[PDB]
Write an enzyme that holds these catalytic residues in place. Structure first.
Site, PDB file in Angstrom:
ATOM      1  N   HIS A  67      17.913  91.193 -35.781  1.00  0.00           N
ATOM      2  CA  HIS A  67      17.664  92.266 -34.779  1.00  0.00           C
ATOM      3  C   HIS A  67      16.219  92.205 -34.277  1.00  0.00           C
ATOM      4  CE1 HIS A  67      21.559  93.865 -36.276  1.00  0.00           C
ATOM      5  NE2 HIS A  67      21.711  94.122 -34.942  1.00  0.00           N
ATOM      6  N   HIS A  71      16.632  88.210 -30.298  1.00  0.00           N
ATOM      7  CA  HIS A  71      17.963  88.827 -30.029  1.00  0.00           C
ATOM      8  C   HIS A  71      17.894  89.590 -28.697  1.00  0.00           C
ATOM      9  CE1 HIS A  71      21.788  90.896 -30.472  1.00  0.00           C
ATOM     10  NE2 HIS A  71      21.151  92.030 -30.291  1.00  0.00           N
ATOM     11  N   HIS A 105      17.557  97.327 -26.194  1.00  0.00           N
ATOM     12  CA  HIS A 105      18.794  97.909 -26.772  1.00  0.00           C
ATOM     13  C   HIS A 105      18.687  97.990 -28.299  1.00  0.00           C
ATOM     14  CE1 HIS A 105      20.345  93.888 -27.842  1.00  0.00           C
ATOM     15  NE2 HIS A 105      21.155  94.560 -28.653  1.00  0.00           N
ATOM     16  N   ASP A 106      17.811  97.232 -28.937  1.00  0.00           N
ATOM     17  CA  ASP A 106      17.613  97.325 -30.415  1.00  0.00           C
ATOM     18  C   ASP A 106      16.129  97.624 -30.739  1.00  0.00           C
ATOM     19  OD1 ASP A 106      20.158  96.895 -31.927  1.00  0.00           O
ATOM     20  OD2 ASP A 106      20.146  94.795 -31.170  1.00  0.00           O
ATOM     21  N   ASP A 216      25.883  91.700 -26.366  1.00  0.00           N
ATOM     22  CA  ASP A 216      25.305  91.955 -27.708  1.00  0.00           C
ATOM     23  C   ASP A 216      25.808  90.891 -28.667  1.00  0.00           C
ATOM     24  OD1 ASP A 216      23.685  93.337 -29.664  1.00  0.00           O
ATOM     25  OD2 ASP A 216      25.383  94.622 -30.190  1.00  0.00           O
ATOM     26  N   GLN A 268      33.908  85.468 -40.833  1.00  0.00           N
ATOM     27  CA  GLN A 268      33.601  85.224 -39.398  1.00  0.00           C
ATOM     28  C   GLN A 268      34.904  85.103 -38.609  1.00  0.00           C
ATOM     29  OE1 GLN A 268      30.490  84.779 -37.422  1.00  0.00           O
ATOM     30  NE2 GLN A 268      30.242  86.216 -39.128  1.00  0.00           N
TER      31      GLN A 268
HETATM   32  C1  LIG Z   1      28.080  92.964 -35.914  1.00  0.00           C
HETATM   33  C2  LIG Z   1      28.036  91.467 -35.837  1.00  0.00           C
HETATM   34  C3  LIG Z   1      27.448  90.782 -34.778  1.00  0.00           C
HETATM   35  C4  LIG Z   1      27.503  89.320 -34.775  1.00  0.00           C
HETATM   36  C5  LIG Z   1      26.844  88.685 -33.634  1.00  0.00           C
HETATM   37  C6  LIG Z   1      26.462  87.257 -33.898  1.00  0.00           C
HETATM   38  C7  LIG Z   1      27.412  87.593 -32.786  1.00  0.00           C
HETATM   39  N1  LIG Z   1      28.095  88.555 -35.662  1.00  0.00           N
HETATM   40  C8  LIG Z   1      28.644  89.217 -36.737  1.00  0.00           C
HETATM   41  N2  LIG Z   1      29.191  88.753 -37.894  1.00  0.00           N
HETATM   42  C9  LIG Z   1      29.453  89.858 -38.687  1.00  0.00           C
HETATM   43  C10 LIG Z   1      30.060  89.784 -40.079  1.00  0.00           C
HETATM   44  C11 LIG Z   1      31.578  89.531 -40.028  1.00  0.00           C
HETATM   45  C12 LIG Z   1      32.207  89.681 -41.374  1.00  0.00           C
HETATM   46  N3  LIG Z   1      31.909  88.939 -42.478  1.00  0.00           N
HETATM   47  C13 LIG Z   1      32.712  89.444 -43.522  1.00  0.00           C
HETATM   48  C14 LIG Z   1      32.607  88.906 -44.879  1.00  0.00           C
HETATM   49  C15 LIG Z   1      31.646  87.963 -45.244  1.00  0.00           C
HETATM   50  C16 LIG Z   1      31.495  87.408 -46.528  1.00  0.00           C
HETATM   51  C17 LIG Z   1      32.303  87.837 -47.543  1.00  0.00           C
HETATM   52  C18 LIG Z   1      33.252  88.792 -47.202  1.00  0.00           C
HETATM   53  C19 LIG Z   1      33.431  89.321 -45.913  1.00  0.00           C
HETATM   54  C20 LIG Z   1      33.516  90.549 -43.051  1.00  0.00           C
HETATM   55  N4  LIG Z   1      33.230  90.651 -41.668  1.00  0.00           N
HETATM   56  C21 LIG Z   1      33.798  91.543 -40.685  1.00  0.00           C
HETATM   57  N5  LIG Z   1      29.125  91.013 -38.025  1.00  0.00           N
HETATM   58  N6  LIG Z   1      28.618  90.659 -36.850  1.00  0.00           N
HETATM   59 MG   LIG Z   2      22.176  97.608 -32.107  1.00  0.00          MG
HETATM   60 ZN   LIG Z   3      21.927  93.978 -30.499  1.00  0.00          ZN
END
Ligand SMILES: Cc1cc(C2CC2)nc2nc(CCc3nc(-c4ccccc4)cn3C)nn12
Ligand SMILES: [Mg+2]
Ligand SMILES: [Zn+2]
Length: 312
Positions: A67, A71, A105-106, A216, A268
């Site tokens: 963040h 970003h 935005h952040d 975002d 992911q």
């Molecule tokens: C909010 C946000 C923004 C972005 C931006 C780059 C584009 N990428 C993102 N990747 C994740 C994280 C996903 C994610 N890993 C897990 C996970 C991981 C390891 C072990 C167990 C579960 C669950 N879950 C939903 N959140 N996220």
């Molecule tokens: Mg934010």
């Molecule tokens: Zn952001």
């Protein structure tokens, strides 16, 4: 008569959605300004104020893994790419507002989620019960606007100034990913029942909402080696939060637990199916020229599939 021009490779690659702004911090301000000049005009903002405003915004982003200032400029580029590929759909005022909304935005992100502020009992959670960080980001945006020499909208009428600050506010709030799911569901229906109409301001607010979540997340729309190395930035923040959760005596969700590194690829994947793909799908339907974002998002989906099968 004072334009910004960029090296040839950038001048050409910057107009594409998958453009990466690179590792030279000192160029990002010029890159941003270049984007404003092409997207909005040379006239949009007095250059002395714009520069001074850009440098106070930079100063108010912290040195967190994800963040960060990088970003902020990345998200503003994705917005530039959308506005340049859809240049008749948006008002002079929206073009001004959204690029500033994206950069800001952040502001002042600490690299902790709204959930961790609440459970820590941080003062900001008392000031703002929902979309805690997002309302803080909007607050800091007004702050920096009111610093002497920083009002980049001084030329706007009283009404115009009020309209743009409202665009920025709803834009920043919308980056709250908890609000996205419902926003996309409503935009899904409206389009598919043919009821979606861009002269309805409440409908335009929703479309901008989705745009903001698209920009975002645009790390997932990049070349695979950029997506792969950004996912390390995101997880370092999340594992730092899980550590902090543990220090309050609470088991963090697996996403935030570093002892569960190995389930990242599967994590992911879940994320692309449940959030990114729907976001870029619904956005393509509403704004057809944004298709590359969906194509690139699908390619990276497939690259995580390949990691899961230990082909990499
Ligand atoms: C909010 C946000 C923004 C972005 C931006 C780059 C584009 N990428 C993102 N990747 C994740 C994280 C996903 C994610 N890993 C897990 C996970 C991981 C390891 C072990 C167990 C579960 C669950 N879950 C939903 N959140 N996220
Ligand atoms: Mg934010
Ligand atoms: Zn952001």
């Amino acid at each position: 008569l004072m334009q910004f021009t960029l090296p040839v490779r950038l001048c050409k690659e910057i107009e594409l959605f998958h453009f990466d702004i690179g590792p030279f911090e000192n160029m990002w301000p010029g890159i941003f300004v270049y984007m404003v000049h092409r997207s909005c005009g040379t006239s949009c903002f007095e250059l002395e104020k714009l520069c001074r405003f850009i440098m106070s915004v930079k100063k108010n982003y912290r040195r967190v893994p994800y963040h960060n200032w990088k970003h902020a400029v990345t998200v503003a580029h994705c917005m530039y790419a959308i506005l340049q590929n859809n240049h008749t759909l948006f008002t002079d005022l929206e073009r001004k507002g959204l690029l500033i909304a994206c950069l800001c935005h952040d502001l002042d992100h600490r690299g902790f989620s709204n959930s961790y502020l609440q459970k820590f009992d941080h003062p900001l959670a008392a000031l703002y019960s929902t979309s805690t960080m997002e309302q803080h980001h909007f607050s800091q945006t007004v702050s920096i606007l009111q610093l002497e020499g920083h009002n980049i909208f001084s030329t706007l009428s009283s009404s115009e100034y009020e309209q743009v600050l409202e665009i920025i506010r709803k834009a920043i709030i919308a980056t709250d990913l908890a609000l996205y799911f419902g926003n996309r569901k409503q935009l899904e229906e409206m389009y598919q029942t043919g009821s979606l109409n861009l002269n309805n301001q409440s409908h335009r607010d929703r479309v901008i909402g989705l745009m903001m979540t698209a920009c975002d997340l645009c790390s997932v729309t990049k070349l695979w080696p950029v997506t792969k190395l950004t996912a390390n930035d995101i997880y370092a923040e999340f594992w730092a939060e899980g550590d902090e959760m543990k220090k309050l005596g609470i088991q963090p969700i697996p996403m935030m637990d570093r002892d569960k590194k190995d389930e990242v690829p599967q994590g992911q994947l879940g994320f692309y199916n449940a959030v990114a793909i729907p976001c870029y799908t619904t956005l393509t339907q509403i704004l057809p020229p944004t298709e590359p974002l969906l194509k690139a998002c699908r390619d990276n989906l497939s690259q995580w599939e390949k990691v899961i099968r230990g082909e990499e």
